[PDB]
Amino acid sequence: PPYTVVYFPVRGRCAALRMLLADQGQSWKEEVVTVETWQEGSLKASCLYGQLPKFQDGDLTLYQSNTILRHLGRTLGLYGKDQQEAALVDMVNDGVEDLRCKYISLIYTNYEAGKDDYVKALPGQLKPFETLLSQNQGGKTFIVGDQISFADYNLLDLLLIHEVLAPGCLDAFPLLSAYVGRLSARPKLKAFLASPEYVNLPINGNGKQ
Amino acid sequence: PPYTVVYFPVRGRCAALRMLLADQGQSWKEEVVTVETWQEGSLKASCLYGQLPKFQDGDLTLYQSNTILRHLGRTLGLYGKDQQEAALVDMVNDGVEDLRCKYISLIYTNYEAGKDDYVKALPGQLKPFETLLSQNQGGKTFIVGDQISFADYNLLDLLLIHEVLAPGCLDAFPLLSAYVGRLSARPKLKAFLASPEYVNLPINGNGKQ
Numbered sequence: 043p044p045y046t047v048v049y050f051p052v053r054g055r056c057a058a059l060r061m062l063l064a065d066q067g068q069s070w071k072e073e074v075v076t077v078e079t080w081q082e083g084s085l086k087a088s089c090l091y092g093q094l095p096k097f098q099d100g101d102l103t104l105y106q107s108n109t110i111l112r113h114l115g116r117t118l119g120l121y122g123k124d125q126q127e128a129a130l131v132d133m134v135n136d137g138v139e140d141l142r143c144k145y146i147s148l149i150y151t152n153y154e155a156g157k158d159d160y161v162k163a164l165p166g167q168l169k170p171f172e173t174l175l176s177q178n179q180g181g182k183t184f185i186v187g188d189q190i191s192f193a194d195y196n197l198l199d200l201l202l203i204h205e206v207l208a209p210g211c212l213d214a215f216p217l218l219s220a221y222v223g224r225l226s227a228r229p230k231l232k233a234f235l236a237s238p239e240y241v242n243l244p245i246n247g248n249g250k251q
Numbered sequence: 252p253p254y255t256v257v258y259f260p261v262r263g264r265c266a267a268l269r270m271l272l273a274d275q276g277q278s279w280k281e282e283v284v285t286v287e288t289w290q291e292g293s294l295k296a297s298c299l300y301g302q303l304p305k306f307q308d309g310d311l312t313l314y315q316s317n318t319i320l321r322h323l324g325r326t327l328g329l330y331g332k333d334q335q336e337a338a339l340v341d342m343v344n345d346g347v348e349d350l351r352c353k354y355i356s357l358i359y360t361n362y363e364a365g366k367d368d369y370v371k372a373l374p375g376q377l378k379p380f381e382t383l384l385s386q387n388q389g390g391k392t393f394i395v396g397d398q399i400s401f402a403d404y405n406l407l408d409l410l411l412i413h414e415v416l417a418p419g420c421l422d423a424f425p426l427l428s429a430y431v432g433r434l435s436a437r438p439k440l441k442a443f444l445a446s447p448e449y450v451n452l453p454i455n456g457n458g459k460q
């Protein structure tokens with residue numbers, strides 16, 4: 043295959059791009075990095091920002107999960123129908139990235155002490171996405187416009203992991219709830235989500251979710 | 252156009268996009284929001300993610316600083332020559348964003364106790380950008396390719412604020428040092444950087460830098 047994903051054995055910041063690749067019927071290779079191989083130091087020192095994921099598209103070596111998403115969004119036509127839609131797609135993805143950073147902080151730095159406050163603040167953090175859906179064809183299609191974008195796969199992942207963290211958190215958000223059901227039912231994506239390559243990886247690397 | 256920037260009276264997350272507009276000879280309106288006006292709650296409630304900056308481009312309203320940069324990048328041709336370069340531009344911008352988030356965390360949440368460790372870690376955080384320069388025309392043009400991109404304005408701002416936090420932090424990095432001097436001397440940008448509109452705003456909102 044022309045694509046390779048280089049990452050720890052976790053869903054994490056590769057879950058959305060994997061969903062995108064599977065739903066778009068693309069082939070790729072998974073190169074798995076163990077904690078031990080990481081600790082040896084050589085791979086880390088060779089990574090641009092000392093971190094994973096690393097992604098290869100032929101001889102193009104990328105880092106940064108959102109860079110990978112935008113690159114696939116460009117090359118596979120998942121980035122809006124025009125320049126204005128592309129901006130809206132970026133606006134959604136940046137909002138998803140902001141919440142994901144908060145989620146990552148909770149999971150890895152403050153799970154015990156922070157979980158109650160986080161879950162209390164969650165409706166206010168999810169509401170913008172419900173608002174975006176409500177303003178786009180009554181929430182019946184995608185997060186921007188009438189075709190899927192890379193921001194849909196990232197938002198979907200963000201919602202899926204939040205359902206595990208805070209079961210029922212989308213009960214307050216009918217359009218988000220229906221949206222998760224709808225996208226999750228896309229045949230190639232449904233198959234991927236049920237498959238061992240997805241199900242047998244943990245969401246995060248520290249046993250918390 | 253026309254362009255409107257809605258923000259607090261600080262450089263912060265609008266510095267790069269202002270540098271971009273000035274350097275590109277664009278006109279814009281600053282809509283300054285005071286802390287007092289923000290605390291009233293009304294503008295905040297109307298903001299997609301309850302935050303500034305907000306940006307207007309004719310009938311298009313955007314939020315998210317990097318969405319604004321990418322939109323200006325796309326519409327003004329500051330996004331590399333092709334898709335491969337666009338990906339590289341995103342990779343640089345996402346690395347700038349990661350370090351900006353670290354800088355913001357330090358400034359706003361942990362300056363006194365955290366500055367020493369931050370400054371000790373700083374060389375390892377800047378080196379990737381020196382490495383990128385070294386791999387592109389010997390560092391003699393821009394961060395990606397042969398034309399300026401939105402990532403250059405964001406990296407330039409990141410470098411400038413880091414020189415204030417940690418004077419001498421570029422001294423070990425000749426390509427970054429030369430790059431800052433070169434970009435800063437571009438006539439319109441030089442004029443902007445010297446102007447009261449830039450000089451008489453604080454970098455951050457809490458008196459720290």
Ligand SMILES: N[C@@H](CCC(=O)N[C@@H](CSCCN(CCCl)c1ccc(CCCC(=O)O)cc1)C(=O)NCC(=O)O)C(=O)O
Pocket residue numbers: 050051052054055077086092093094095105106107108244246247248249345349
């Ligand atoms: N802005 C970047 C951020 C990427 C990022 O933050 N990557 C981190 C986080 S990667 C996911 C967390 N992680 C690394 C911890 Cl050091 C990790 C996750 C899963 C496993 C395996 C599972 C272990 C288990 O379940 O017990 C091991 C490590 C990383 O590479 N850490 C290594 C380092 O900085 O030295 C992006 O968006 O790509």
Ligand SMILES: N[C@@H](CCC(=O)N[C@@H](CSCCN(CCCl)c1ccc(CCCC(=O)O)cc1)C(=O)NCC(=O)O)C(=O)O
Pocket residue numbers: 136140259260261263264285286295301302303304314315316317453455456457458
């Ligand atoms: N991912 C987003 C992040 C945007 C963001 O973090 N914006 C914040 C940070 S804006 C800069 C910090 N700030 C707001 C703190 Cl209430 C602020 C900064 C400067 C001043 C005035 C300066 C006073 C002075 O020292 O002279 C007032 C507020 C914001 O709007 N906060 C307000 C809120 O959430 O209610 C993006 O990139 O745009």
Ligand SMILES: [Ca+2]
Pocket residue numbers: 327328329330398399
């Ligand atoms: Ca150009």
Ligand SMILES: [Cl-]
Pocket residue numbers: 054055146
């Ligand atoms: Cl992660």
Ligand SMILES: [Cl-]
Pocket residue numbers: 263264355
């Ligand atoms: Cl800021």
